[PDB]
Symmetry: D2
Subunit: 321 residues, 4 copies
């Protein structure tokens, strides 16, 4: 039987009303007993928060612990139970810091376990089947939600409330899991996990990266406050294909000239924030984030800034990962 | 032939009438001359990422003047795609007419291979003159689709099919000029709007904040220092803030700056009675909009109230 | 408290004087706080077994119930496979503005994370909501309110399998909170010209699946079986293969109505594209899908077989 | 410069008013392509794609195989009608014995149209065809700035320029003013890895497709059997469910040695094994994550070497 550790970052995603190693994981196994037949489950309570309270300190603790567990010959896979709000940021961060080909599966629930028609039991059961599947090896970190397997690079929460809120808008799901039957149809061709250049093993604090939301009649004062608070990087969630308002652009130009990395993304939801469009990135000293979203671009810029603030090197990073 | 005015806000979206850029549109798409008697005016000459409240107010007041004219049957506005959704939503609540108002643009420049501007503009004229377009509210016509201004958004950076109505869908189609409606909005618009910008010179300042893990107080604080009258928070999932940011928004709301919760996710309602105690913190839930349109509705709300309850009713109505 | 009748067409989708409805109320007791529920069993079949006899029995019973002053709405529990056809049929045969809600479950009641309980609870909330009056027949699934005209099952297994690919949902229902954002502008229900009150059997209408190297033998077999109408699910914008076209032209000349739809899944099968409908004697189904176009053609054939009159029906409803 | 052949299956997809006149007219309409590649042209067929047949698929697959076996040929681009592009692309995806790019491209608007999509689609297709990352991606459809794997592609809309979709996955890449990026690749075997070889085949097996609905019939199953169908695709209700009368005729078909493969009318998702239909008892195949028209192509290929239920289920569970 495969040995799998469930790391809980918060409360139970499945069941309600109630020795693996963490009381939350004991309550999951009691609520979804079918998972005991699939894997020998150990549990740990890695953090004790809602995903809207996530911090870089928790991301570092989680990455280091996932790396320690998957370095163990006895451990086949890790499943992380996670709040849906920021699951895509944690998954993306682990996709570039986990140094293993063994499966890492993040899973959550859009409805509380106490709800009518709670999604957590099926999502967790499916997650365990994905974690133990031979084809999950070397797929990178995945999100399993609503019978779908999403590449961490591509995944996002695209809806506030729907059980089907997770999407991969620039690709689509890489696979399906239906009552535990796992089938992959595609795999990412963007480097992840072992192929990532990033190493957070010695890092205690990630670089500060702010995100700004672009609109008509925009401002310089939020760029200025990010600079004053010691931002190392700024993601600009631009209008359309990463376009700033002029007052904001002038402040971003000043930020870039001071050595703060300015990375253009978009508020729109999907598509690439492309190079050689309307913004003169080379003159103004900006990076184009291409086919990500602001919150995942922030994670990649945080990781980039652990070893470079050079525009050309960071553009290569955005054009590679 | 019906009389329609085309208001340009930038350059040509494709390729006498009273504006050289509209004359160029007519040269580029001469079939439109058989559909309508076209007059042209140049309201601004900017990319839509340069839009300001000043240009929104100038455009809305001029649309209101034109549609009050007995001879004028509809207005078409050519607009950059990046912020077309905000201008359309603003006009949807400030235009006091049932006559058609159609916004149109082009995801590819007029000089491009397979430029989308010619067909978009030709389809927009057909929608503007169609009998069924009356009392549909302001509409965006793109990629053979008719989108209610309330619902419409640019959802992709480059695709010719970048416009969508993620919470509904298109209200109709226009295919080589053939116009068909299948649905209509049941949210009040145009003539049924309470807002009146006829003597407004400047709109209230409303900032937008982008939420993420390890979020900050310093952008709330900078918005307050700059005289924000409202803040849209583009929250994580169902409008959730990071704690440090929440505490700064609570301070902002106690100071009498309206805080309205939206979402960064892209679709769905930022709901009341979820994980945020809006009544205790003094916030508004923006429900089924997006941050950029929620900002437009809060800017209009603030022209007549800063009361949390009154503004929640505005979000739960429009 | 409002009085609602639940009509069951199969078993229980979750977990009065119908045992199946009693089991629903046992499975989702919160519904008893929302409404006084009466229950009837109209059929006891999977939706892949549906027939025109069951559609007619259901429509006439819905009409009787909604004519009662005491009855505020009807909810019908239905298999997902053919819910869109039943909903569309009722949308043109229910002579009332009172809410008619179809609901089902993509996962059996016995499954982990069964969707039936929340779907049914949401369906009752929609059925009793003031704003649901005169919206036409709706499908309520996965927190979404879909117009019967526009609704289709688009996925084999997903709980989010229902969609309105040419519009979108007309509203939402989240933990019982009901909000409409749009309504259909196509006439329905009380405004429908159709009347099935004394109809015992619907006209036969076959559906053909177009592809390269297509055949005439399925057209020919539909004709031999007494088809009154044929829906052709054509390639792209309703295009037939030549051999098939020739057989359809023959079918139309014989007085069997040929209506062009598409296999693609969304969009209009338009007039004035590559097929000369007027010369070949065909109808273009426009913005439907083959399974709903079959329903509208079956109802059309209750009053006419005239190509012009049937085109107007497709261009109206 | 890279040498690419354009095979035209019909008229010009771009423009209005070498080796084939249609390709000469494409190059006159989109001259930027001459900067990218040395283009040769051939007129392989002269039809709208609604008139496609297995004879034309065989001709096309054999000619693509000959051209890609040429050391100097980098890639083939095939201009094709949108209606049945997905069927031709899926057929080539299992019969082209090469990793060199094969790109199918078309236009949802005629080249004479306002805002014709052909010029940019064709320009993009040439950039995909000459991209080194396009090697061993399988046969692809390039439409509307998107790169779709042939296995996953379908036309999902009647008229939209964005009518192409990959509903079970998503596009494998993007091409935006010629800039080619891949994000994913199919993990299902294709092209050089496929077991099928049509080199000796002059005629493909007959496979009919049936459209399921309430109050369904047996007479279309019966007519397919009488016409000598070797296979039937059943486009079932929901997860591939038949009406009972139709199921009884399909069971008779299967007993008579005609292969019955269950698909779905719905548009997306898997027609799964071990659902409500007892496939092993009734002698049916479940087509899983395809659609009826692509399931037809795979069944036609399967029938060139076997009619065994178990072997054909393995084919559908593999490709």
């Amino acid at each position: 039987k495969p040995q799998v550790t469930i790391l809980a970052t918060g409360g139970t995603i499945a069941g309600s009303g109630e020795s693996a190693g963490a009381v939350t994981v004991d309550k999951l196994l009691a609520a979804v007993p079918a998972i005991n037949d699939l894997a020998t489950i150990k549990g740990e309570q890695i953090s004790s928060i809602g995903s809207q309270e996530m911090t870089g300190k928790v991301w570092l603790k989680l990455a280091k612990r996932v790396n320690e567990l998957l370095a163990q010959k006895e451990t086949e896979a890790v499943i992380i139970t996670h709040g849906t709000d920021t699951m895509e940021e944690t998954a993306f961060f682990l996709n570039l810091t986990v140094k293993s080909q063994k499966p890492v599966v993040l899973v959550g629930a859009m409805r509380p376990g106490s709800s009518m028609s709670a999604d957590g039991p099926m999502n967790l059961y499916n997650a365990v089947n994905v974690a133990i599947n031979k084809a999950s090896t070397n797929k990178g970190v995945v999100i399993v939600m609503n019978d779908e397997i999403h590449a961490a690079r591509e995944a996002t929460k695209l809806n506030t409330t729907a059980v089907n809120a997770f999407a991969s808008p620039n690709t689509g799901k890489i696979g399906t899991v239906y009552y535990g039957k796992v089938e992959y149809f595609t795999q990412s061709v963007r480097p992840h996990t072992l192929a990532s250049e990033f190493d957070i093993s010695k890092i205690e604090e990630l670089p500060r990266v702010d995100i700004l939301y672009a609109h008509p009649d925009d401002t310089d004062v939020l760029v200025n406050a990010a600079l004053q608070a010691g931002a190392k990087g700024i993601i600009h969630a631009g209008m359309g294909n990463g376009n700033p308002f002029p007052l904001t652009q002038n402040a971003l130009e000043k930020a870039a000239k001071s050595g703060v990395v300015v990375a253009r993304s978009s508020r729109v939801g999907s598509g690439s924030t492309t190079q050689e469009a309307e913004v003169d990135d080379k003159k103004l000293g900006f990076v184009a984030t291409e086919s990500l979203n602001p919150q995942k671009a922030r994670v990649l810029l945080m990781l980039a800034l652990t070893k470079t603030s050079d525009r050309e090197a960071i553009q290569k990073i955005f054009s590679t990962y």
